[PDB]
Amino acid sequence: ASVYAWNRKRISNCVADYSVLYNSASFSTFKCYGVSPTKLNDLCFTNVYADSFVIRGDEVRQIAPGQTGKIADYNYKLPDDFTGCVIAWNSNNLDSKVGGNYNYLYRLFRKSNLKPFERDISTEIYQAGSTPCNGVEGFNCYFPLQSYGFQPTNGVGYQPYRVVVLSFELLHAPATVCGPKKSTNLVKNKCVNFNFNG
Amino acid sequence: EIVLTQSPGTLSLSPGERATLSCRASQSVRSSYLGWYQQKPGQAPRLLIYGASSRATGIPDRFSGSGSGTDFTLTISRLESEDFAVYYCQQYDNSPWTFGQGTKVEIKRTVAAPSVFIFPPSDEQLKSGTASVVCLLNNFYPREAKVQWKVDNALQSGNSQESVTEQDSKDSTYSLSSTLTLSKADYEKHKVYACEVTHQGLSSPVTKSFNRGEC
Amino acid sequence: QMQLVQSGPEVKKPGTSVKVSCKASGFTFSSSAVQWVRQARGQHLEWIGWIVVGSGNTNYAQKFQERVTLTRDMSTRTAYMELSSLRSEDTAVYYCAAPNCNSTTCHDGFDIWGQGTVVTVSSASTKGPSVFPLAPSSKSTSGGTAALGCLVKDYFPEPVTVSWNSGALTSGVHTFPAVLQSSGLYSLSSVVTVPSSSLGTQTYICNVNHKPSNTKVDKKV
């Protein structure tokens, strides 16, 4: 989806294999705020939210707590105490076409900065003057959505990047989304120090 | 895609009297998108009225536009010496943004006399192989006045360059000089050249002439 | 301070393409819009086009639609206009104008203006002026106030700065605007009013100036 209408998916009731997505050797950027990524399979939470969208390579810096710009102020904001991960990689093969791809947009004009995890799809004409717009474009009445010029011959600076943000929410619920548990071989007829499931 | 005829063509009033410019559009426009600008001689224009009825910032309180439906107005409710400039109306509607012709305001002064003057050629020029005669008019009012050329009592309509200086500040008149350029072949075959003026402050044209061979 | 600072005067030849720029300073340039207009000498203003700083959308008039481009750079806050397929009918002063905006909502009319760049189109080569004596005729005036002055012919390109007495005596003089002729060279004349009693008893020398050829000359008349 576009960054201004990012898509959320709620993941629950399943055994997440976090350390396998860690070592894909595919993701250019992998960060984890508040949770160390080497200990992901032993801390388990109630719900995990996944948010996916597409931005350009120079704006990936903005997808982080405490950052400001155009993406972090009008499109997608993360709180100060975000606990989760941000994963991004370069998808110039799928999201750009010779001459450009004109199906990915981003909001450019807004009255005020977005609150954390707020999604807006309103397309009313932005009033940049004190003049009522009455829905007809012109001077001081601009359309708020600007397209991306995704051209395959750019640098990596303007090259498209796909971003997935995982939000590990913990409410006071018995934490259904837990990771895998290694189960060693079974040995018999020796004084052993067993630990069965419980 | 929009016709903005501006009235009046020129404005001629003394410092203190009141003026009413107007911009007339040949189709409807909305008052929120018409602006009046002022340009003083030689400088960049400065915005005066935006929204057809709202003043700008820094403009005096005397200035005030009106801005009706499609037929817009501009009332200057007292004229200073600062006030003489050119004024334009622009429209911001989606069609090609157009300007008016622009109205010029001049100070009403007394009808002065355009003293006809002449200057013969010079040997410095007649060493270069050329010819040029200039007939001068100075300190007259109003601007409108015409100079004609005589060459052995005949006109010359091609190769007549006329220029006029902008209105002065101290006396507030105009002074225009017209130059008539020839070849030293031409000036070597003809003798007598003449010019005259037509203006309101006088009754008949007055002649300042000269004849070749006598500097 | 709220201002636009524009580039310098340019001289180009027909068929080439010209590029002019103006840099914004003193306000939030990232939300405003910039319009470009032009003006001949003493003629009406003509609207060239306009552009939005943020999105970059542009609009041009029908006359200039196929031979102008408007661009901008947010990094240095600069606006550019390129005009191509030149003609001799494009010698004029160009202005860029924008409204004063600060980051939230902003003004409803083009309040800020540049100082304008002068663009000359001529295939004539850069030359230098010549100064000629407007003879005061011995009896052109009865002892009232008489005319005497200077011709200046064949100078290109503009401008030429004139004076008398090293600039000292300035009372009563009229320096005429330049005139563009067939030969491509401009021509202005400067005149003074002094009686015939002066011409034989008062002294005057004429001063002319042109720096692109460093020209300082004096002509007794």
Numbering used by the authors:
A (entry chain C): 348 to 545
B (entry chain L): 1 to 215
C (entry chain H): 1 to 85, 86C, 87 to 221
What does the paper say about this structure?
The major interest of neutralizing therapies has been targeted towards SARS-CoV-2 RBD, which is the core region for the host cell receptor ACE2 engagement. Here, 3 receptor binding domain (RBD) specific monoclonal antibodies (mAbs), 58G6, 510A5 and 13G9, with high neutralizing potency blocking authentic SARS-CoV-2 virus display remarkable efficacy against authentic B.1.351 virus. Surprisingly, structural analysis has revealed that 58G6 and 13G9 both recognize the steric region S470–495 on the RBD, overlapping the E484K mutation presented in B.1.351. In summary, these Fab-S complex structures suggest that 13G9 and 58G6 adopt the same potential neutralizing mechanism, wherein they are capable to simultaneously bind to 3 RBDs, occluding the access of SARS-CoV-2 S to ACE2.
In individual complex, each 13G9 Fab interacted with one RBD in the “up” state. Similar to the structure of the 13G9 Fab-S complex, only one dominant particle class was observed for the 58G6 Fab-S complex, corresponding to a 3-Fab-bound complex with all 3 RBDs in the “up” conformation. Likewise, an almost identical steric clash between 58G6 Fab and ACE2 was observed, indicating that the SARS-CoV-2 RBD-ACE2 interaction can be prohibited by 58G6. Meanwhile, 58G6 Fab was shown to recognize the same steric region using its CDRs: CDRH2, CDRH3, CDRL1 and CDRL3. In parallel, an additional site of residues 450–458 on SARS-CoV-2 S (S450–458) was observed for 58G6 recognition, which contained the linear region of S450–457 we had identified with the denatured RBD. In detail, we identified that 58G6 recognized a region consisted of amino acids 450–458 in the RBD. Of note, recent cryo-EM structure analysis has revealed 3 key ACE2-interacting residues (SY453, SL455, and SF456), indicating that S450–458 may be the critical site taken into consideration for SARS-CoV-2 prophylaxis. Moreover, direct contact with a hydrogen bond was found between T105 in the CDRH3 of 58G6 and K458 in the RBD, but not for S105 in 13G9. We found at least one specific hydrogen bond within this region, between 58G6 and RBD, that may contribute to recognition of the unique linear region by 58G6, rather than 13G9. The cryo-EM analysis revealed a hydrogen bond between N94 in 58G6 and the carbonyl group on the main chain, rather than the side chain, of SE484. Indeed, the sustained affinity of 58G6 to B.1.351 S1 has been confirmed by the SPR, which may explain for the potentially broad neutralizing spectrum of 58G6.
